[PDB]
Structure 1
Amino acid sequence: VASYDYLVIGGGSGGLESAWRAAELGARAAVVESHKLGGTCVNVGCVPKKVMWNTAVHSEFMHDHADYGFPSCEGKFNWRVIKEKRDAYVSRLNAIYQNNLTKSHIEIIRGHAAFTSDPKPTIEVSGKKYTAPHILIATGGMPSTPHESQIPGASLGITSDGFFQLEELPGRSVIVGAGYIAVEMAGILSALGSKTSLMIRHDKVLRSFDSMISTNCTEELENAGVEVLKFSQVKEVKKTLSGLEVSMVTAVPGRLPVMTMIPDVDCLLWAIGRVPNTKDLSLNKLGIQTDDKGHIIVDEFQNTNVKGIYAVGDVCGKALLTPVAIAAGRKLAHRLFEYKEDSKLDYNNIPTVVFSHPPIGTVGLTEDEAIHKYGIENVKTYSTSFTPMYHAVTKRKTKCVMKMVCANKEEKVVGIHMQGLGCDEMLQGFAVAVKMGATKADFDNTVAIHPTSSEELVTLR
């Protein structure tokens, strides 16, 4: 058995950062990677999505061309051109990552890890055993998919991965889900041409986002060409000769259920969830506890119930984002290897941007969460709704909405929620202020930048 100081299972966002931080502090680590380095984000997440989103934003603006004094462009978009480019970028990123690892003296055990029966924690990668006084499970998660048992014909559809493997823009797309992935897949496909349908269980999407957002977003979708199928469910999927035939059920409360066929569907995309990547780890050999869905259970310091084993990222189920994974593995290394007894990530005021059209950005508490925490009496919220001046000359229109949630008498800014043009780059700073403890006064005592959409946040009233 080879002994290292750190043995990180999983070369994705959290895995790598924790190993990098560790090696830079003097330790000897080894990332065990079973597939391609970079994890879900580089290979089938953040990176590919953004490229496709940038592209979607491009067809959009093409529509305001004439309005800006230029001749129109018909627009026969060629899927494969941007696909092949996107995939290249991904290769370049892989190489770059491999290099950085080796550059930092990080051994890469190339294969699939699983814990052994051995008393002291140990893992076996391809018939070989490795161990270390510190092992970090950072194996992430994967797409949740329905059962033929539950939904007959479920396996006929694809997921976000399958999406990133498509070599042709499907003519008829149907997406099932109401979260950021479902919302983004719906936006890219329909902006790029596909006749998209977003099948949601309720009346709106991003339901766990501040009411205003959940509302605005369901609307901008409709306004843009996405068909939101509310209170609908996929009963069964069938492969016809002309595509797929989806049997759906619309149970609009107050009305009688109605069965519907969506025929000639080219792409059926399941965007219902991410299940943890933990069973093939043989967690049961050590008794590393998990929840009923397989998520690995950890304390505020990412400690499993076993000594010398920790967990970070998607695998734990909390705050499924690359920066949260990174930030947790970075603080862990310091904890362990720099002896900082308290470096733990703070899970409050985490910023998130959803790349829908226009983009959403949000940090902090929703109004309801503020309310349930402070009490109606101690929660003031400021809002605004305007038309970016980009649309001052376009027939096409999107709007921008911003809401500030304030707590107590000082009006501590506990939550920022907005959707609109530029909201993607706009969030990070206010997130810093929101993280430092900013109050409304501080925001109002900042000279504005005119003309910009961001200036509307420091002049609310």
Structure 2
Amino acid sequence: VASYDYLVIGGGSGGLASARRAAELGARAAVVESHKLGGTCVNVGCVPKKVMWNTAVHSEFMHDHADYGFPSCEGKFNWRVIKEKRDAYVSRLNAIYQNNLTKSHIEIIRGHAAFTSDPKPTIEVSGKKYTAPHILIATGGMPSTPHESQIPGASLGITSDGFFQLEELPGRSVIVGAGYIAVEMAGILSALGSKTSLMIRHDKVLRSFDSMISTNCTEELENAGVEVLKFSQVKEVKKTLSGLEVSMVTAVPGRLPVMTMIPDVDCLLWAIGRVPNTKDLSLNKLGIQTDDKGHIIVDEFQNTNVKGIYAVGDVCGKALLTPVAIAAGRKLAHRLFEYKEDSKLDYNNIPTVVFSHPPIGTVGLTEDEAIHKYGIENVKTYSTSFTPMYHAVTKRKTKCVMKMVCANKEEKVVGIHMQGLGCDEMLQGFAVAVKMGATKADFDNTVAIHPTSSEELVTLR
């Protein structure tokens, strides 16, 4: 049984972040990884996603070309070529991580950890046993897919994981789901020239976001030529000669339910949520607490109910983002090995960008959440809608919408929400301000930068 100061299960965002910091602070650390280093962000997530989003915006700028005085240009996307480059960049990052771990003398253990029934907390991998005083569970999540028992043929669909093994551009795609992953996939696929539908259970996408964003994003998807199938659900999927055929019910409000069939579908993509990676960890051997969906229960310090065992990141099911996983992993390593006992992540005012077309930036409270929290009379919103000057000379149009949610007499800025060109690089600075408790006065007394989109957030009236 080999011994460390710090055993980390999972070499993704949270695990690597925490292993590294602990090594810096002088711990003897090991990372267990069953697949590739870098986890979801590197391999099947934020990094390959961004490369494909960059590609997709190349597609949109191809369209605007002739408008900008350039040769009317032309057509055909080669998926193979960018797929190869994207793979090679991911592999590059895998090696960068293995090499940085090794330079820091963090041991890599290759394989699938489970906990044993030993009384000391102890894992085993290809069954050698391993233990530390401090074990971090950082095993992330995976996509959920329907069971065949609910929807016959469900396993003919792929997930976002399979999206990154796609070797050619699907001629015709149906994406199921209404969250940020579904929206992003639909936008990439349609931009590059797949005939895309997005199938959602209600009338709008991103329904947990501020209703301005929810509404505007549903519109901009339609405008970009994504077919949004509202109030619709897959009932089953069949293999045919010419691809998949998808049965849906559409059940619009105050009309009769109608069953239709989508033929000729090359890619059916389930984006209906993620489940945590805990089923195979033998958690019940130690009585580690989960909820009904198998998230690990932690306190504000990332403690499980079992002393000396911790969890960060997707596996806990709160704020499912790479930088959250990282910051929580780093804070925890400061607590354990620098004995900074008040080291913890604040989960408030965490900013998000959704990489739609155009991208969404959001931080803080929706106008709804603010009203519930402050009461209707203590909430003031300011908002705006304009066409970026980029589009002054193009036929194609997108909007920029911005919204500031303000609280109380001093008008503390408790929420910013936007979708527009450039809003992906816009948000970080404003989220700094919002974490400081900036009030609208603070915004109004910053001099504007002209001409930009961003200057509108400091000139709202």
Interval of TM-score (by shorter of Structure 1 and Structure 2): over 0.9
Q: Once the 2 structures are TM-superposed, how far is the Cα of residue 345 of structure 1 from its aligned partner?
A: 0.6
SS of the residue 2:292 aligns to = coil
Q: Once the 2 structures are TM-superposed, how far is the Cα of residue 343 of structure 1 from its aligned partner?
A: 1.0
2:437 and 2:132 map into 1 onto residues whose CA distance is 40
Output one character per residue of 1:50-107: Cα deviation in whole Å (capped at 9) or x when no partner: 0000000001011110000001111201010000001000011111111111111110
Output one character per residue of 1:223-271: Cα deviation in whole Å (capped at 9) or x when no partner: 0000000000000000011111100000001111000100000000000
Output one character per residue of 1:113-153: Cα deviation in whole Å (capped at 9) or x when no partner: 00010111110111111111100000000010001100000
SS of the residue 2:115 aligns to = coil
SS of the residue 2:35 aligns to = coil
Q: Once the 2 structures are TM-superposed, how far is the Cα of residue 279 of structure 1 from its aligned partner?
A: 1.1
> Do residues 185 (structure 1) and 185 (structure 2) align?
yes
2:40 and 2:27 map into 1 onto residues whose CA distance is 26
1:135 and 1:26 map into 2 onto residues whose CA distance is 16
2:153 and 2:437 map into 1 onto residues whose CA distance is 51
1:51 aligned partner: 51
With normalisation by structure 1, the TM-score equals: 1.00
1:162 and 1:26 map into 2 onto residues whose CA distance is 40
Q: Once the 2 structures are TM-superposed, how far is the Cα of residue 436 of structure 1 from its aligned partner?
A: 1.1
Q: Once the 2 structures are TM-superposed, how far is the Cα of residue 23 of structure 1 from its aligned partner?
A: 0.3
1:445 aligned partner: 445
SS of the residue 1:27 aligns to = coil
| CA root-mean-square deviation | 0.5
Output one character per residue of 1:340-383: Cα deviation in whole Å (capped at 9) or x when no partner: 11111111100100000000010000000001000001110100
Output one character per residue of 1:325-352: Cα deviation in whole Å (capped at 9) or x when no partner: 0010010000111111111111110010
1:243 and 1:129 map into 2 onto residues whose CA distance is 48
1:167 and 1:113 map into 2 onto residues whose CA distance is 32
2:287 and 2:422 map into 1 onto residues whose CA distance is 47
SS of the residue 1:430 aligns to = helix
2:122 and 2:89 map into 1 onto residues whose CA distance is 36
SS of the residue 1:349 aligns to = coil
Which of structure 1's runs of 4+ aligned residues deviate more than 2 A?
none
1:149 and 1:407 map into 2 onto residues whose CA distance is 48
Output one character per residue of 1:389-443: Cα deviation in whole Å (capped at 9) or x when no partner: 0000000000000000001111110010000000000000001111111111111
Q: Once the 2 structures are TM-superposed, how far is the Cα of residue 286 of structure 1 from its aligned partner?
A: 0.3
1:109 and 1:77 map into 2 onto residues whose CA distance is 41
Q: Once the 2 structures are TM-superposed, how far is the Cα of residue 112 of structure 1 from its aligned partner?
A: 0.7
SS of the residue 1:405 aligns to = strand
1:445 and 1:332 map into 2 onto residues whose CA distance is 38
Output one character per residue of 1:190-245: Cα deviation in whole Å (capped at 9) or x when no partner: 00000000000000000000000000000000000000000000000000111111
Q: Once the 2 structures are TM-superposed, how far is the Cα of residue 37 of structure 1 from its aligned partner?
A: 0.2
SS of the residue 2:280 aligns to = helix
2:343 and 2:217 map into 1 onto residues whose CA distance is 37
1:175 and 1:48 map into 2 onto residues whose CA distance is 18
With normalisation by structure 2, the TM-score equals: 1.00
Q: Which runs of 5+ in 2 are unaligned?
A: none
Which has the larger displacement, 223-232 or 70-79? 70-79
1:313 and 1:237 map into 2 onto residues whose CA distance is 34
Q: Once the 2 structures are TM-superposed, how far is the Cα of residue 317 of structure 1 from its aligned partner?
A: 0.5
2:124 aligned partner: 124
Which has the larger displacement, 139-148 or 120-129? 120-129
1:89 and 1:365 map into 2 onto residues whose CA distance is 36
2:426 and 2:222 map into 1 onto residues whose CA distance is 25
1:401 and 1:270 map into 2 onto residues whose CA distance is 29
1:133 and 1:441 map into 2 onto residues whose CA distance is 50
SS of the residue 1:197 aligns to = strand
SS of the residue 1:150 aligns to = coil
2:182 and 2:229 map into 1 onto residues whose CA distance is 13
1:369 aligned partner: 369
SS of the residue 2:7 aligns to = strand
Output one character per residue of 1:290-313: Cα deviation in whole Å (capped at 9) or x when no partner: 000011000000110000001010
1:64 and 1:279 map into 2 onto residues whose CA distance is 49
1:39 and 1:17 map into 2 onto residues whose CA distance is 12
2:331 and 2:337 map into 1 onto residues whose CA distance is 10
2:279 and 2:230 map into 1 onto residues whose CA distance is 35
2:77 and 2:390 map into 1 onto residues whose CA distance is 24
Percent sequence identity over aligned pairs: 100
1:19 aligned partner: 19
1:296 and 1:394 map into 2 onto residues whose CA distance is 50
1:128 and 1:56 map into 2 onto residues whose CA distance is 46
1:442 and 1:100 map into 2 onto residues whose CA distance is 42
SS of the residue 2:343 aligns to = coil
2:436 and 2:334 map into 1 onto residues whose CA distance is 22
SS of the residue 1:415 aligns to = strand
1:368 and 1:274 map into 2 onto residues whose CA distance is 25
1:458 and 1:98 map into 2 onto residues whose CA distance is 44
SS of the residue 2:424 aligns to = helix
SS of the residue 1:170 aligns to = coil
1:239 aligned partner: 239
1:161 and 1:111 map into 2 onto residues whose CA distance is 20
2:154 aligned partner: 154
1:107 and 1:72 map into 2 onto residues whose CA distance is 55
2:347 and 2:445 map into 1 onto residues whose CA distance is 28
Q: Which runs of 5+ in 1 are unaligned?
A: none
